[PDB]
Structures are given as C-alpha cells and as structure tokens.
C-alpha cells in the first residue's frame, strides 16, 4: 500500500529565539572563561542563519545543515568565545593543541554546529589589545565542557613556590596581541558553538497541518517520522509519558502535541 499525503503536528509556539543576543553582542568573552546560555521554548529559524554570506566556517557535525528546520531538539546551548585565526581548526572532536587541551574541549559523541567569522574590524586595537586572554600552562588536560577560571601560580620546577613569581614559576594566563595590521592568521576570529541533544521544547518553523485518521499516510509528531494508519487509541498514558513502544522497540503510540490525544500506529 502506497501513502497518500503527509501530516505534521508541532506544538503551538510562535515567538522567536534569542539568537541576536548571542551573535550580535557588542563584545564577547575570552576563551579561558567561555560564556554559555540555555535556549528553550521558542521557534528557531536556522535557515536565516545558514544562508548568510557572513560566516566563513559553518560545520554542523551530527546533523546536516540543510535539514535543520525539520527536527526537534532537547537541551539547546550556545557558547561564545574569541580565538585566533589558525586555531578555528581545533574546535572539533578529537583535536589536540592548546585551545583544545587547556581552554575549551569538545567530546567525541558531539552533535552540534561550529560557526565562525572574521571580526578584525571589531576586536582589534592599534596599541596592544590586552583584554582577551587564554590559559597557557595547566597541570593536566580537561574534561568535556569543563571551565577553569583560576589564576593561581604555576610550578614548572621541582622546587615549590608560593604566591610569588620568579625563576621557573609562571603566571598561567597570556594575552593575544591583536593588532589591526596582523596578517590573516593572527586576526581575531569569533566562534559560536551550538550543541543540542537528540520531551522537546525548541524547534523549527514548519506550519502545522490538521490530523487525518484511519488510512495510510505519512506523519511527523515532534520530529518523529514514519508511515502508518493512525487509528484511535486505548492506551492509558500517565500524564508525563508521551511516546510509546512495544517489544519490537519501535514507536507505536504517540500523543498529539496540539490536541492532547493518544493515537496508535499500525503499520501499512
């Protein structure tokens, strides 16, 4: 049996997401104290971001950049920091260096996007730009997503030190020397890493259709797809449960998120 048409049932949420407050801020944070922000309960248009000519790096990893307007996401974040030119290639899984080992480390099962642009005309002073720093010495490596704002004195020698600076005891931070005539490669690039996880609240702007039953069509209830015959259901969901599975471990009963009702999925 062949399907007939498609059905989409997203929630009834209308407002837009605070993406201007992450991308268009007046000045970001330095990389050793990277900023972080939760995004929830909003409608996220990723098309308007992807189809700008501004971004000179856009590498989504678990999800492809084209089909971002269709899925639904849980635990969206957004992380803003400032790094050099030849260090954008380290914001990735399984890279090694100084930005990826002492400052900001991405895990291996990563599912997000990595955006960058060139901001030489916004972050660079004619003297010395002493207000973006990065950690240079640390004893060990980092976890995934672990910050370390601690300006305690380091010890590279066998002899101990104290709160003084001397021979073989160093101050752990360091500044970039951003300069409006640095070559392309030492200029300030400006990074935002999105990360999400695949009970959802924030997702894309697909216009909601209306429910048809009792025949073989397509269906999309909160990013979950398939084809099947949406009957009327008898299952008794306690009000925190939404999906529903059998021993064959496929989706067979779904709550319609617009009008709260339990439906069954019998395969065509």
């Amino acid at each position: 049996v062949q399907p007939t048409e498609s059905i989409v049932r997203f929630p009834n949420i209308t407002n837009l997401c605070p993406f201007g407050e992450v991308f268009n801020a007046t000045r970001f944070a330095s990389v050793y104290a990277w900023n972080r922000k939760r995004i929830s309960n909003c409608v996220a248009d990723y098309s308007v971001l992807y189809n700008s000519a501004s971004f000179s790096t856009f590498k989504c990893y678990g999800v492809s950049p084209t089909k971002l307007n269709d899925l639904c996401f849980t635990n969206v974040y957004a992380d803003s920091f400032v790094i050099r030119g030849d260090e954008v290639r380290q914001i990735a899984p399984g890279q090694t260096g100084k930005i990826a080992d002492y400052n900001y480390k991405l895990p291996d099962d990563f599912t997000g996007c990595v955006i960058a642009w060139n901001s030489n005309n916004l972050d660079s002073k004619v003297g010395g730009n002493y207000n973006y720093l990065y950690r240079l010495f640390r004893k060990s490596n980092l976890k995934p997503f672990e910050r370390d704002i601690s300006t305690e004195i380091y010890q590279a020698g066998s002899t101990p030190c104290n709160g003084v600076e001397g021979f073989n005891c160093y101050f752990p931070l360091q500044s970039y020397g951003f300069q409006p005539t640095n070559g392309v490669g030492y200029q300030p690039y400006r990074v935002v890493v999105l990360s999400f996880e695949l009970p959802a609240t924030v997702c894309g702007p697909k216009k909601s259709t209306n429910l048809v039953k009792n025949k073989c069509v397509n269906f999309n209830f909160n990013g979950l797809t398939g084809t099947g015959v949406l009957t009327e259901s008898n299952k008794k969901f306690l009000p925190f449960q939404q999906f529903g599975r059998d021993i064959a471990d496929t989706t067979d009963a779904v709550r319609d998120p617009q009008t709260l009702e339990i439906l069954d999925i019998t395969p065509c």
Partner: antibody, heavy 122, light 107 residues
C-alpha cells in the same frame, strides 16, 4: 572591596615621592591598574598603566621618562615612583582597575579610589 | 587622538532631555566610556563600550553612536543627576579624556 591610596602631600621642586594603592577584598593579579590625576578645577588626565606581564606598561606624553609604575602581586600593592618633579605636577591622584573580557565590563575602569593630594611648591 | 566635547555650559529644568556631544578626531569603534563626577568625590562609570549600561546605573541613561559621533541622553531628570560628564576613548595609548559638560539647575 576598595582601593586606598597612601602617599605624600608636599615636596620641594625637583625631588621624589612614592605613592601606594592597597587593594583589599578581590583577586588583585587578574586586573590591569591605572593612575589618573586632576589639576585643581580642571579635567581629568591619564598618567600611567601596568598590566599582567610585569614588563608591559605605558605613560603619558609629558611624564614619560620621569615616572615608573610597578606592582607587587603578593602584598596586593601598586606603586608609582615620581622623579624630578616640575611645578605643574600638582594634583589629586587616583588608582582605578580595568577588567578583561569575561562577559561583563571591559576596559572601562569602574572601581576607583580615595585620592591623595600632591603639592609641589617652594 | 584629540577628543572634543561640547556644550561646555548647560542649564536645564527637572524633567527635560539633554544632549551631550563628544566628537572624536579620527574614527575608533565602539570604544568610548562615559563618567559622572559629583563635585568632591571620585568619578563613577555609566556607559561602557559606547552603548551599554553598567550594572547599578538606572535605565534612564542611554548612549549611542559609533565611528566619530557619540551622544549621551538622559530621558527625564532627577535632582540627583547634576554633575560634570566626561567621555574617554579606549583605543590608543594614551587614553585621553574630554573637557566636561557641567550640568546646572535652572531657576
């Protein structure tokens, strides 16, 4: 948290004085530190600055080659060493702190100090 | 660099708008800070990076502009807002201040 300045009040022309600034209640070594003066009834004016490395520092157009700023991250103090004073180096001197970018304020010195009058006359 | 601040004198009544102008002499960026000095005490920070309010300052003050033209604007005065207003550039060393706009009470 506050920034208190000690330091002298009266010298002859052509001598030396050594000011101080004793910060208390925050992390001293993670900020930059500046000196700003004020001739009596006139506008503000920028004098010196010292940063993280201990060998990077700046001075004005006039006083460069006469003053010498240095810090000491253990006693939480900031020093200024004036040498060969002129007539018109008389003012009230302030110490101020400018943070570095972690999301909040950046390079606008926000916390200030008391002020110690310096009189240079015969 | 050489920053030029005007008007030098001002007199307003309680409940008006005031426009202070501080033009630079070569272009910088969003690097400009605004200070307030009540006579006798230390100065105090209001607007940093040419447009952002500093936490503690009310949302009555608001500055704007970039490039070479910068402007501070109070919406409707209070009796506690009468001082001298300074504008500072953060771009090149030395950091030069302005001249000041002394803000008076009218009767």
């Amino acid at each position: 948290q506050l920034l208190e300045e000690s330091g002298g009040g009266a010298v002859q022309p052509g001598r030396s004085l050594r000011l101080s600034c004793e910060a208390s209640g925050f992390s001293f070594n993670s900020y930059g530190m500046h000196w700003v003066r004020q001739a009596p009834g006139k506008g503000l004016e920028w004098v010196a600055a010292i940063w993280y490395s201990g060998s990077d520092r700046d001075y004005a157009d006039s006083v460069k080659g006469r003053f010498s700023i240095s810090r000491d991250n253990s006693k939480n103090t900031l020093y200024l060493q004036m040498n060969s004073l002129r007539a018109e180096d008389t003012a009230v001197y302030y110490c101020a702190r400018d943070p570095h970018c972690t999301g909040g304020v950046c390079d606008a010195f926000d916390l200030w100090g008391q002020g110690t009058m310096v009189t240079v006359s015969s | 660099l050489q920053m030029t601040q005007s008007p030098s004198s001002l007199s307003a009544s309680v409940g008006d708008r005031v426009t202070i102008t501080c033009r630079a002499s070569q272009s910088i960026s969003s690097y400009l800070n605004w200070y307030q000095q009540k006579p006798g005490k230390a100065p105090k920070l209001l607007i940093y990076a040419a447009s952002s309010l500093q936490s503690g300052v009310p949302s009555r003050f608001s500055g704007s502009g970039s490039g070479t033209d910068f402007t501070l604007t109070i919406s409707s005065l209070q009796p506690e807002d009468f001082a001298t207003y300074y504008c500072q550039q953060s771009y090149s060393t030395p950091y030069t201040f302005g001249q000041g706009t002394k803000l008076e009470i009218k009767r």
